[PDB]
């Protein structure tokens, strides 16, 4: 009963045992959306570059994510969406991790308020953030995402181009989730076999606002997903064992009860229609 469930999520929690320091200073209060959900100092994104007599400075809100039930699939960062304070420090992050899928799951505002400032220039323009060059050579729109074709470079080697490809998902319900899961599905098949075709390419940067409702939720059905794909559909599929497992990389993912209710929901219908798929004729 009670007791047995407490002693159980006791045993479960590990945000004791993993210090959050670098993102509690001070010096990185205009750093963080929440002061409350930051990142674990073991698996935090470390930014390249900078100089340690300014305090602060290699820090942003944002960690390494794995799937870490399988011996040491694609690998993601997941972090909070930009501030004004921090666009620079996204780029230096997708530029030294090669990242080269990008996806954000929110809109810039959602009535009406600010949840990522944008970190892209609009339509055949180039904007220069800190010592990157990032243009935007297109945007392909379906009713519920958008990819945006970006290249980016370093401002003063132009010569040297990475393509990055930036999904955004725009029909994501402010306070709640998708109310039925085959847009995140079509989404999140596009996202895969983009990153399928660049063996080389670094994680996979995953974003919302806070960086661990939405973000986290995504990841996890990907997580499964990459699961099912790889050792098949009647796999064992923990979902909470794989939450837990993610949560001990950043606190709080997958944060809410529609959240987690979302996540059977989609890989359920994941599953189904795959099968439905193969038992065809």
């Given at each position: 009963?009670?007791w047995?469930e407490f002693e159980?999520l006791?045993?479960?929690?590990?945000?004791?045992?993993?210090?959050?320091?670098?993102?509690?200073?001070?010096?990185?209060?205009?750093?963080?959306?929440?002061?409350?959900?930051?990142?674990?100092?073991?698996?935090?994104?470390?930014?390249?570059?900078?100089?340690?007599?300014?305090?602060?400075?290699?820090?942003?809100?944002?960690?390494?994510?794995?799937?870490?039930?399988?011996?040491?699939?694609?690998?993601?960062?997941?972090?909070?969406?930009?501030?004004?304070?921090?666009?620079?420090?996204?780029?230096?992050?997708?530029?030294?991790?090669?990242?080269?899928?990008?996806?954000?799951?929110?809109?810039?505002?959602?009535?009406?308020?600010?949840?990522?400032?944008?970190?892209?220039?609009?339509?055949?323009?180039?904007?220069?953030?800190?010592?990157?060059?990032?243009?935007?050579?297109?945007?392909?729109?379906?009713?519920?995402?958008?990819?945006?074709?970006?290249?980016?470079?370093?401002?003063?080697?132009?010569?040297?181009?990475?393509?990055?490809?930036?999904?955004?998902?725009?029909?994501?319900?402010?306070?709640?989730?998708?109310?039925?899961?085959?847009?995140?599905?079509?989404?999140?098949?596009?996202?895969?076999?983009?990153?399928?075709?660049?063996?080389?390419?670094?994680?996979?940067?995953?974003?919302?606002?806070?960086?661990?409702?939405?973000?986290?939720?995504?990841?996890?059905?990907?997580?499964?997903?990459?699961?099912?794909?790889?050792?098949?559909?009647?796999?064992?599929?923990?979902?909470?064992?794989?939450?837990?497992?993610?949560?001990?990389?950043?606190?709080?993912?997958?944060?809410?009860?529609?959240?987690?209710?979302?996540?059977?929901?989609?890989?359920?219908?994941?599953?189904?229609?795959?099968?439905?798929?193969?038992?065809?004729?």
């Open positions: 009963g009670f047995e159980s006791q045993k479960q929690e590990v945000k004791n045992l993993h210090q959050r320091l670098e993102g509690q200073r001070p010096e990185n209060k205009g750093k963080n959306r929440y002061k409350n959900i930051l990142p674990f100092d073991h698996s935090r994104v470390i930014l390249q570059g900078r100089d340690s007599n300014i305090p602060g400075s290699d820090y942003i809100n944002a960690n390494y994510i794995k799937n870490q039930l399988l011996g040491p699939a694609k690998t993601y960062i997941a972090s909070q969406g930009c501030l004004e304070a921090t666009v620079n420090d996204f780029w230096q992050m997708a530029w030294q991790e090669n990242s080269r899928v990008i996806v954000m799951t929110t809109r810039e505002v959602e009535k009406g308020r600010n949840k990522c400032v944008p970190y892209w220039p609009e339509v055949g323009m180039q904007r220069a953030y800190g010592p990157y060059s990032v243009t935007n050579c297109g945007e392909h729109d379906t009713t519920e995402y958008k990819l945006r074709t970006l290249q980016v470079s370093p401002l003063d080697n132009g010569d040297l181009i990475r393509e990055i490809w930036h999904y955004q998902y725009l029909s994501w319900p402010d306070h709640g989730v998708p109310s039925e899961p085959g847009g995140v599905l079509s989404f999140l098949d596009q996202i895969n076999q983009r990153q399928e075709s660049l063996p080389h390419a670094g994680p996979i940067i995953v974003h919302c606002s806070a960086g661990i409702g939405r973000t986290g939720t995504i990841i996890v059905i990907d997580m499964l997903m990459e699961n099912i794909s790889t050792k098949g559909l009647d796999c064992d599929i923990d979902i909470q064992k794989t939450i837990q497992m993610v949560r001990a990389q950043r606190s709080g993912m997958v944060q809410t009860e529609a959240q987690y209710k979302f996540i059977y929901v989609a890989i359920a219908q994941f599953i189904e229609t795959t099968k439905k798929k193969l038992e065809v004729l």
